[PDB]
Ligand binder design. Structure first.
Ligand code: HEM
Ligand code: HEM
Lengths: 253, 250
């Protein structure tokens, strides 16, 4: 009754009478002196939301596994109050269901977090598609987790084809069979290793051909598992113009 | 109703919960409710917090909301947010504390997803070999990778909030804001994705040739551009030395 921070409400399917808590009045942004009314409640929600609330009450009117819908109000000039209305069915007797009761929750923090994740997910899509160098993300066991657009073009495998496979499918032997051991060896020593030391190695495409490449790796930790983000740089063109330059330089010396 | 209800009156120290409330805590249907059993589902760290929280609500009365995870079904857990308020028997006596149990497994799953994304972003910014810059729809720098700090001579704290034009020489420096707005208004076959060689300028005042790849995205009604800068100083010196050796032989 006091404090809490959550509002409560009550509504009867028959006679459409509504009674909300004092803490719930503040959530709706109106109600300093006006009494509670079903019409007043639907007058605060936006038109599309109002329709959703009506379908929800009808859904719970006939059967209905609970009631929970979220909507935003126009409480302040440049901000909205996100509210998650939850309610439950309580019948009088075996005859009918006469009054739905529930609570009003403030989900402003929950919506800000949801939005933040959406922005991050969208950005990752953009990065994966835009980045010119092949970007590959593996897990502690070498299982590919992300495979950028450039990785597809360079290695010949699509993301759907590469995700879930071991990163060793991108290299020829003997590295292919010994790569798994290379990862487990680094996870035990835990010293300032080749992570951040670009060394040139050779990768293999699905095609079967091979090419010289430089890789940069960055480690991260999440949920008890480490993940490695690789950035591949193809050196085929660099090594050939460097060879033709060092060959056209030896035509006189 | 997928929410639980419960009340722990300070007087008599009893505790009764609803049917959905016991299912959330992972308690047998036959077992009876009690304050002792409730604290037995929480782990020691969480248990201490709830007890100190109850001691604080009694000696204040400003509500009580705590989140914890119980070992519901071995492998994983059930995240529960317990929120409650206190009812007063008389003018100066607080007697009951009533509230609800909420399932926050999905809410906690979103928090963890965001955290992984934020940690991965920091990893990319620190590890990406090419300079990575992210700007808003008005050219204001939002993100500045480690490589961008070394190439342009600005720190991420110094660069963030500045117009991206501080990295360019004239005349691009003055017309860059126009290239952005003329793109947003007439978005069609522009050079966003096609990267021609452009000239960048470090904080020194020194300039270098560069190629840039851009990617656009939308978030909250506003566009954002992610650029990847590739310094062409070495590439140009190399191929310039190719024509300085292929034409000198006449
Ligand atoms: C595509 C061709 C690749 C080849 C041929 C290759 C080969 C190798 C080799 C030879 C080593 C050991 C170096 C040494 O002991 O001197 C190594 C280590 C390692 N590689 Fe790969 N690698 C490739 C791609 C990747 C990618 C894309 C990632 C991660 C996204 C990765 C993750 C690792 C890790 C975590 C280690 C151990 C840590 C370290 O020593 O730096 N590899 N790899
Ligand atoms: C630092 C050196 C940079 C220079 C010298 C430069 C210069 C230019 C030039 C010459 C154009 C095209 C004008 C035309 O089409 O006639 C342009 C357009 C544009 N640039 Fe930049 N730019 C630089 C960096 C960036 C960065 C880092 C970003 C974003 C991350 C960016 C975003 C854009 C956008 C959004 C447009 C308009 C869309 C388009 O026409 O492609 N620029 N800039």
């Amino acid at each position: 009754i006091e404090g809490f921070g959550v509002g409560t409400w009550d509504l009867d399917l028959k006679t459409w009478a509504l009674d909300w808590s004092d803490t719930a009045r503040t959530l709706l942004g109106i109600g300093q002196d006006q009494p509670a009314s079903y019409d007043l409640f639907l007058s605060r929600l936006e038109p599309d939301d109002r329709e959703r609330v009506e379908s929800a009450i009808k859904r719970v009117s006939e059967r209905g596994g609970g009631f929970d819908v979220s909507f935003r109000v126009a409480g302040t000039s440049n901000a909205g109050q996100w509210i998650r209305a939850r309610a439950g069915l309580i019948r009088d007797e075996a005859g009918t269901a006469r009054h739905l009761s529930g609570i009003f929750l403030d989900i402003d923090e929950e919506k800000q977090v949801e939005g933040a994740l959406r922005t991050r997910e969208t950005h990752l899509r953009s990065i994966l598609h835009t980045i010119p160098d092949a970007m590959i993300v593996i897990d502690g066991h070498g299982i590919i987790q992300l495979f950028s657009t450039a990785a597809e073009r360079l290695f010949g495998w699509s993301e759907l084809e590469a995700i879930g496979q071991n990163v060793n499918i991108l290299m020829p032997e003997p590295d292919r069979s010994r790569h798994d051991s290379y990862i487990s060896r680094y996870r035990t020593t835990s010293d300032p290793h080749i992570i951040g030391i670009g060394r040139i190695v050779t990768g293999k495409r699905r095609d079967g051909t091979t090419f010289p490449m430089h890789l940069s790796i960055g480690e991260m930790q999440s949920g008890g598992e480490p993940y490695f983000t690789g950035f591949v740089r193809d050196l085929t063109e660099h090594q050939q113009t460097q060879a033709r330059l060092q060959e056209l330089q030896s035509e006189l010396v």
